[PDB]
């Protein structure tokens, strides 16, 4: 019903840094909190960030909280997800998403429902 | 959905509340887009607080002045030897009396005019007149050099409260309203006391207004808001030379001395042609609420005192009595003869006299018409309104009927998914 | 940026944005002086109700007492996002008082289970 | 539910109950005005008092001030369960500004504390 | 503890440290005691507003910007007295309370949206 658009990026050497990014269309981008999801090419789905709606609170998971910043805009209706020290292990196919935390006013939700097209993140 | 409480403090929200108002003068208004808030002019207690604070202010001014006790005499009146035209005659006396000064025993033969209703017959041997407020009150003297000109007052409400002003056009007086506002301060609303006509006042925007309470109640006074106003001039043509005594330490009397000329009445100007024209406006705003082809009649104002069935106002200083019979008889220039008074009994008191010092000269004022205060005859086919006023709220509704003032309730309480720990 | 009351008829998820515009027109001869001690009453009651409950220098203040559907049978979606906080207002005029009350007993609970916790060594 | 007062009677533990039953009650010509400014006057300082201490906006106010066994040498099991908070301030008068400067130091104490915690890196 | 006001003339650095001195003298003829009051209740809407509620010394999350007063802290904190910081950052004032204000709003969504979560 809605359009989830990534960017993704190259390869990147042990230790650099790689930004990836997300933009929206179709629904009122301000209005809904978003996240990451990474899955692993032969693996199952990894929540790896949340963001809320006004980007004001970032929630992530222990291996990722001093390497990964989740940063949002509403005026671009664009998120990004700028990765350091990143590693092999860190190989994976990246999603964002529409869904997870609500802020309060609204009904709970606690889940993802819109789902992006993805984006290769490749570590040498 | 496990909802809690959750408190909000700040919340812009209201309640209707009665509150007291405190005044401002010359030495913002935020637009409430999506709020329709229902208006009563009928239960404004803006209304009633205008009206004692008006009151209120008027002792206060007229307290420290002469007390004119040493005028409650006896009146030796003669007729005015000047030269009085037709309608004139004894509507003004020459009156000679013996009135004290400084020194506690020497007193000072006076003559003075006064007007005709100014004094009342008596069957003394030996004075023919005395004041009609003696036998009722002691009569003040307005302090000189003090105006009576109505000055513009802002009501403010206390910090806690504001007062919602209603900016639709053609509304009526009560019921809903979409386009609103809320200010801290009125607009400057000047304190004009008349009767029958409104004078100096807000004007409507598109059309004549017929406000009123139960309009099928004819015991009620329609108040007519006009959208044009209509020039009324009113001249005292009588070059009055005013003379001054003492009578006594630290008291002035003020009196009429002579009239230089010819003595004229005194009279207003209403345009023939604009006011019919108003006239026309007023009906076919009326027809709405009696029917199209129901006949509507304007008739003088029959019934009362001298107070209500003139049009009663203050030019200049001087307080005139207009008798408004060529503006009120018709059925669907104009010079009306004006009577002028100088002991006033204002709003509905009897033992509140003042006396009017007169004004050296010729008074001139050039007011507007700016709406009208009608009642209608009760008890078919045609329907007979007539000048009708001398409460004095109605001046006051005919401004602050678009002004109400509300509580703010900045507390409230909502569900949110939030929980305290 | 839209003033005092100025939200007051937009929603109530909007309007909860305007709380300190609403909050710093509430403070600001014999009639003034009357006018300004009642300005004072009326602020100083609401602030000592909002401190027995625990929400002292709040604007947003939440609290434990749950909310009972009696009080009004609506979801978030609609209270939040498509109702006024003036037509909130006139639809809990009942049963205010009860939640108030409800939530002095909830601060006297919680201030006596503070109090033996920290006592707790 | 005893009303105002109703715990005066009552010992410190069972009256310790009631707080907000005696605290609502403190805010609610000229002549009429000088006692509604001295009702706000008690109750500002009283408010100001409170916020010196570190205790705004709470009612049971636990501090970091040890008790003197001078000022009262009883133990909790006569203050609070055989003693009423009449007889108690009839003991302790004579040594409450005392205790009034001790939190007032405390709180200060306290506040740099916190500051100097809030400014490390 | 030199009393009320006797700390004016020293360094913020000795002046912070007697706060209470001053507050204790603003509370303690009808005009001037309403006057008094509602002076006292701005003051406290203004730190209520803030998230400084019931502190003398509160930290707040907005950064100070250089073009206020560019000075360092060895500065401010330990040569210049209040009156005269007060005189400096007199043009500034009204904007640096705005931003307190705003930053306060936003914490308290950030708060009802950190108490949201089950
Ligand atoms: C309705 O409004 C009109 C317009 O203001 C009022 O007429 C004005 O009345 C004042 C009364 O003080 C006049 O001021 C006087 O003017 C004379 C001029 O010689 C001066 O000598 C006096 O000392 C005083 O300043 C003012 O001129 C006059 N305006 C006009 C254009 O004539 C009218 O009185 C108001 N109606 C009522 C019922 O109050
Ligand atoms: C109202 O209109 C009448 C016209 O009927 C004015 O009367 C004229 O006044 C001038 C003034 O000197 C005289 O010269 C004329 O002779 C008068 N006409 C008549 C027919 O008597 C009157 O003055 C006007 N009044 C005002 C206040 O404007
Ligand atoms: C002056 O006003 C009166 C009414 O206020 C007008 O009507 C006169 O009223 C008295 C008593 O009610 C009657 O005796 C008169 O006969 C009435 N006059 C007429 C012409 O019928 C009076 O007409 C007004 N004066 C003018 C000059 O119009
Ligand atoms: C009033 O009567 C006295 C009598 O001496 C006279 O001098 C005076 O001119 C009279 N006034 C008028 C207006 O005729
Ligand atoms: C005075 O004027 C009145 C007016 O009607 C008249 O009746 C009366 O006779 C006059 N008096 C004298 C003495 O001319
Ligand atoms: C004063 O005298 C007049 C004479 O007509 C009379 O109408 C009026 O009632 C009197 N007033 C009092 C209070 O006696
Ligand atoms: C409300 O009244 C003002 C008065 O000028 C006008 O400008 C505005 O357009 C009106 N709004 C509506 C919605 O009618
Ligand atoms: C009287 O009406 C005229 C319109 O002709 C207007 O310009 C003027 O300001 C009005 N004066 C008052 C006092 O309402
Ligand atoms: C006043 O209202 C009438 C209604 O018939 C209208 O014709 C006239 O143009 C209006 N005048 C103004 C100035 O709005
Ligand atoms: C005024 O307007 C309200 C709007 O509903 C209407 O009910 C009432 O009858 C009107 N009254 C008059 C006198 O026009
Ligand atoms: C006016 O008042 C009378 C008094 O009985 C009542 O019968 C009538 O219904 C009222 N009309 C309106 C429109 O309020
Ligand atoms: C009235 O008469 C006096 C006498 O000198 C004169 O100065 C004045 O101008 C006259 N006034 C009028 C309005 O005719
Ligand atoms: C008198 O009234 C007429 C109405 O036709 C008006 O034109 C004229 O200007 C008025 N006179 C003055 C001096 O304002
Ligand atoms: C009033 O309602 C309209 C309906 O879309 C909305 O756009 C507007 O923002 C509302 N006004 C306010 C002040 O929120
Ligand atoms: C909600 O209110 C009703 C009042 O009829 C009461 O019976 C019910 O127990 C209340 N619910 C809770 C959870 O307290
Ligand atoms: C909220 O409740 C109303 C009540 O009928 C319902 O129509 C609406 O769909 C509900 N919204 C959600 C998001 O469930
Ligand atoms: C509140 O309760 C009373 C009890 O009779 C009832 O009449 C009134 O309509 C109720 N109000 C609301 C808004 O439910
Ligand atoms: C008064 O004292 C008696 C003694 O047993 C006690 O039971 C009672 O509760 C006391 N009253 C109050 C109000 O505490
Ligand atoms: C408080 O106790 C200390 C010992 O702990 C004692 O030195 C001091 O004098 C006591 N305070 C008073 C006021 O007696
Ligand atoms: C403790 O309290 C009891 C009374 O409950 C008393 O008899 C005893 O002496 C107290 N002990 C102390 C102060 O050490
Ligand atoms: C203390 O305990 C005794 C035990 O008999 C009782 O009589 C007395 O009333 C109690 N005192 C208070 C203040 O409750
Ligand atoms: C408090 O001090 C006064 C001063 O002498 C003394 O008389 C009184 O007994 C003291 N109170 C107590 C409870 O010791
Ligand atoms: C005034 O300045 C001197 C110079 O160092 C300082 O020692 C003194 O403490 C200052 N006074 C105050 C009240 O701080
Ligand atoms: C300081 O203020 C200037 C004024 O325009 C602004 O441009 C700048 O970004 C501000 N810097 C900070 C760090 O707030
Ligand atoms: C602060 O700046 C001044 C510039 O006048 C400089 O002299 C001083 O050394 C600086 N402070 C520190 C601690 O470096
Ligand atoms: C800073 O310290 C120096 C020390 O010499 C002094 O001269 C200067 O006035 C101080 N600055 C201020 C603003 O007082
Ligand atoms: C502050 O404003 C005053 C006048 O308002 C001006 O003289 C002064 O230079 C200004 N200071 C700064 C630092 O902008």
């Known amino acids: 019903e809605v359009q989830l658009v990534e960017t993704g990026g190259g390869l990147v050497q042990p230790g650099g840094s790689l930004k990836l990014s997300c933009r929206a269309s179709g629904y009122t981008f301000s209005s809904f909190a978003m996240s990451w999801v990474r899955q692993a090419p032969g693996k199952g789905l990894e929540w790896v960030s949340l963001?809320?709606?006004?980007?004001?609170?970032?929630f992530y998971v222990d291996s990722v909280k001093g390497r990964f910043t989740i940063s949002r805009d509403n005026s671009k209706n664009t998120l990004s997800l700028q990765m350091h020290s990143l590693r092999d292990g860190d190989t994976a196919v990246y999603y964002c998403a529409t869904g997870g935390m609500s802020s309060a006013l609204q009904s709970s939700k606690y889940y993802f429902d819109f789902w992006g097209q993805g984006a290769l993140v490749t570590v040498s | 959905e496990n909802l809690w409480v959750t408190v909000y403090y700040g919340v812009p929200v209201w309640k209707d509340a009665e509150t007291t108002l405190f005044c401002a003068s010359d030495a913002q208004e935020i637009h409430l887009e999506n709020v329709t808030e229902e208006f009563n002019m009928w239960k404004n207690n803006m209304v009633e607080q205008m009206h004692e604070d008006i009151i209120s202010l008027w002792d206060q001014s007229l307290k420290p002045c002469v007390k004119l006790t040493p005028l409650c005499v006896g009146l030796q009146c003669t007729n005015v030897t000047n030269n009085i035209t037709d309608d004139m005659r004894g509507e003004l006396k020459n009156c000679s009396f013996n009135a004290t000064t400084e020194l506690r025993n020497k007193r000072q033969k006076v003559y003075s005019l006064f007007y005709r209703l100014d004094i009342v017959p008596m069957v003394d041997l030996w004075t023919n007149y005395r004041l009609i407020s003696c036998n009722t009150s002691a009569i003040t003297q307005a302090c000189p050099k003090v105006s009576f000109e109505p000055i513009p007052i802002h009501y403010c409400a206390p910090a806690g409260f504001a007062i919602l002003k209603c900016k639709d056009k053609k509304f009526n007086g009560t019921g809903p309203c979409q386009n609103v506002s809320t200010v801290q301060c009125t607009h400057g609303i000047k304190p004009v006391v008349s009767t029958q006509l409104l004078l100096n006042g807000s004007l409507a925007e598109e059309e004549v207004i017929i406000r009123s309470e139960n309009i099928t109640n004819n015991a009620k006074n329609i108040l007519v808001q006009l959208n044009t106003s209509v020039q009324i001039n009113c001249t005292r043509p009588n070059n009055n030379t005013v003379k001054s005594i003492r009578i006594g330490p630290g008291q002035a009397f003020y009196y009429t001395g002579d009239i230089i000329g010819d003595i004229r009445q005194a009279h207003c100007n209403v345009s023939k042609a604009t006011w019919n024209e108003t006239l026309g406006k007023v009906v076919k705003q009326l027809r709405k609420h009696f029917g199209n082809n129901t006949i509507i009649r304007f008739a003088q104002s029959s019934g009362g005192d001298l107070e209500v069935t003139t049009h009663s106002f203050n030019c200049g200083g001087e307080f005139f009595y207009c008798n408004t019979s060529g503006l009120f008889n018709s059925t669907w220039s104009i010079t009306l003869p004006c009577r002028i008074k100088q002991i006033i009994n204002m709003w509905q008191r009897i033992g509140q006299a003042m006396y009017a010092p007169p004004i050296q000269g010729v008074i001139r004022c050039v007011s507007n018409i700016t709406g009208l205060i009608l009642t209608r005859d009760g008890g078919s086919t045609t329907e007979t309104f007539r000048p009708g006023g001398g409460d004095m709220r109605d001046n006051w509704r005919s401004e602050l009927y678009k002004y109400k003032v509300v509580k703010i309730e900045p507390l409230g309480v909502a569900p949110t998914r939030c929980k305290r720990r | 940026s839209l003033g005092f009351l100025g939200a007051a008829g937009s929603t109530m998820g909007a309007a909860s944005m305007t709380l300190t515009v609403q909050a710093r027109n509430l403070l600001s001869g014999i009639k003034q002086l009357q006018a300004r001690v009642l300005a004072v009453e009326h602020y100083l009651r609401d602030q000592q109700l909002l401190g027995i409950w625990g929400c002292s220098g709040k604007l947003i203040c939440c609290t434990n007492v749950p909310w009972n559907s009696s009080w009004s049978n609506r979801n978030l979606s609609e209270i939040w996002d498509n109702m006024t906080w003036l037509q909130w207002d006139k639809e809990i005029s009942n049963y205010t008082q009860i939640i108030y009350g409800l939530l002095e007993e909830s601060q006297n609970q919680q201030e006596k289970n503070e109090q033996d916790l920290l006592a707790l060594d | 539910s005893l009303g105002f007062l109703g715990a005066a009677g009552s010992t410190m533990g069972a009256a310790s109950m009631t707080l907000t039953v005696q605290a609502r009650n403190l805010l609610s010509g000229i002549k009429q005005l000088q006692a509604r400014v001295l009702a706000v006057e008690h109750y500002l300082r009283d408010q100001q008092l409170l916020g010196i201490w570190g205790c705004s906006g709470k009612l049971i106010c636990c501090t970091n001030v040890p008790w003197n066994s001078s000022w009262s040498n009883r133990n909790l099991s006569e203050i609070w369960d055989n003693m009423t908070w009449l007889q108690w301030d009839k003991e302790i008068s004579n040594y409450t500004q005392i205790i009034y400067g001790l939190l007032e130091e405390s709180q200060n104490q306290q506040e740099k504390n916190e500051q100097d915690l809030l400014a490390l890196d | 503890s030199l009393g009320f006001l006797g700390a004016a003339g020293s360094t913020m650095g000795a002046a912070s440290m007697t706060l209470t001195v001053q507050a204790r003298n603003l509370l303690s003829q009808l005009q001037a005691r309403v006057l008094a009051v509602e002076h006292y209740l701005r003051d406290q809407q203004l730190l209520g507003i803030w998230g400084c509620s019931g502190k003398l010394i509160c930290c707040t999350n907005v950064p100070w910007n250089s073009s206020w007063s560019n000075r360092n802290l060895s500065e401010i904190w330990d040569n210049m007295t209040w009156l005269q910081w007060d005189k400096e950052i007199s043009n500034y004032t009204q904007i640096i309370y705005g931003l307190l204000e705003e930053s306060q709003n936003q914490q308290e969504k950030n708060e009802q949206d950190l108490l949201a979560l089950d």
């Open positions: 963001i809320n709606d006004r980007g004001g609170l970032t």
